[PDB]
Ligand binder design. Structure first.
Ligand SMILES: Nc1ccn([C@@H]2O[C@H](COP(=O)(O)OP(=O)(O)OP(=O)(O)O)[C@@H](O)[C@H]2O)c(=O)n1
Ligand SMILES: [Mg+2]
Length: 323
């Protein structure tokens, strides 16, 4: 059935999704940040990416931003100038640089009214992340079930302590890709086509990678999968609990049948292997340790068992209880 579980899923979704109120405050914050950038470099553009842009944001979301500028202009000089303007304007945070890549990490706002724990990461010419976000935004527009499904999975992973890339588990973006892989290449009939492998896809090279995909969404036929949100979630938990083979296989968006071995990739960390759809050299699961994968799989299994339980009433709330 999944009727009661679906009802429960939509109720949780409405409580965890970013409110219209917080969203418009994040937009106001972006406008302020843009004004500060204007004063420093009139040619540069400040753009948002990640879950606020794709519509996949939970409450109390962080902001992910990228400064776009002339590639002939070295990013560190403008980065520092931007950072110093932000301090003068009452933001708090850090200026840092890993290798050649400068980053600003804002952690507070003391004047502009966006909060004592206003969090905002600023990159410089991170064009790949913009493209990744365009892909996720396109899928989110293609089927209305994706948004609530992703938010629920993200909320679950947080509650189960398996959403900690610094402590041996998986990033939120990694969970999003696991969702999409399931909806494109596992479920039958598929919820989504693979937009990268479309015969209408046009090559577009950005920083050496092909970020092309079919984005003419209005011409794409609606899904022939009629499953409820509840049923989609249960199949998702089941696939990664019992069917997916993390020791051998790679989550991939580059194969018509979604089949790819770690050996073909030379990805023999590679404990969990998730090939970023555009930056194919990047394993999104590289943060996942052996013990971390054990807990991830354990939680997939526990979720599957809960939804398959014949002991009624099923305590659906325990899906989002802290492990
Ligand atoms: N390996 C990664 C991870 C991050 N990003 C980009 O950075 C964004 C933010 O990543 P993440 O922190 O994992 O998502 P959040 O929305 O910030 O997490 P949450 O919604 O749970 O708060 C992603 O959408 C993605 O575009 C990326 O390009 N490649
Ligand atoms: Mg984000």
């Amino acid at each position: 059935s999944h009727k009661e579980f679906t009802k429960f899923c939509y109720e949780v979704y409405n409580e965890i999704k970013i409110s219209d109120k917080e969203f418009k405050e994040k937009r106001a914050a972006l406008d302020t940040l843009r004004l500060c950038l204007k004063r420093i470099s009139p040619d540069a553009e400040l753009v948002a990416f990640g879950s606020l842009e794709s519509g996949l944001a939970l409450k109390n979301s962080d902001m992910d931003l990228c400064v776009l500028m002339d590639s002939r202009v070295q990013s560190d000089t403008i980065a520092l100038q931007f950072y110093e303007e932000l301090i003068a304007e009452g933001f708090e945070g850090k200026f840092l640089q890993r290798a050649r890549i400068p980053i600003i990490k804002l952690t507070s706002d003391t004047k502009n009214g966006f909060g004592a724990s206003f969090q905002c990461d600023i990159g410089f010419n991170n064009r790949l992340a913009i493209h990744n976000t365009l892909l996720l935004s396109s899928y989110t527009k293609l089927d209305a079930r994706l948004k609530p499904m992703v938010l629920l999975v993200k909320h679950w992973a947080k509650r189960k302590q398996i959403n900690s890339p610094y402590f041996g588990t998986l990033s939120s973006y990694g969970y999003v890709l696991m969702v999409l892989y399931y909806l494109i290449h596992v479920i039958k009939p598929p919820v989504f086509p693979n937009l990268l492998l479309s015969p209408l896809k046009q090559e577009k090279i950005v920083d050496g990678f092909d970020v092309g995909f079919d984005d003419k969404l209005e011409d794409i036929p609606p899904s022939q999968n009629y499953s409820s949100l509840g049923s989609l979630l249960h199949g998702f938990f089941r696939f990664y609990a019992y069917k997916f083979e993390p020791r051998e296989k790679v989550v991939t968006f580059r194969r018509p049948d979604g089949y790819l071995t770690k050996q073909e990739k030379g990805w023999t960390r590679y404990i969990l292997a998730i090939e970023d759809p555009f930056e194919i050299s990047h394993n999104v699961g590289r943060t996942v340790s052996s013990s971390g994968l054990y807990r991830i799989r354990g939680e997939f299994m526990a979720a599957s068992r809960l939804l398959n339980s014949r002991s009624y009433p099923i305590p659906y709330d325990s899906l989002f209880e802290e492990a």
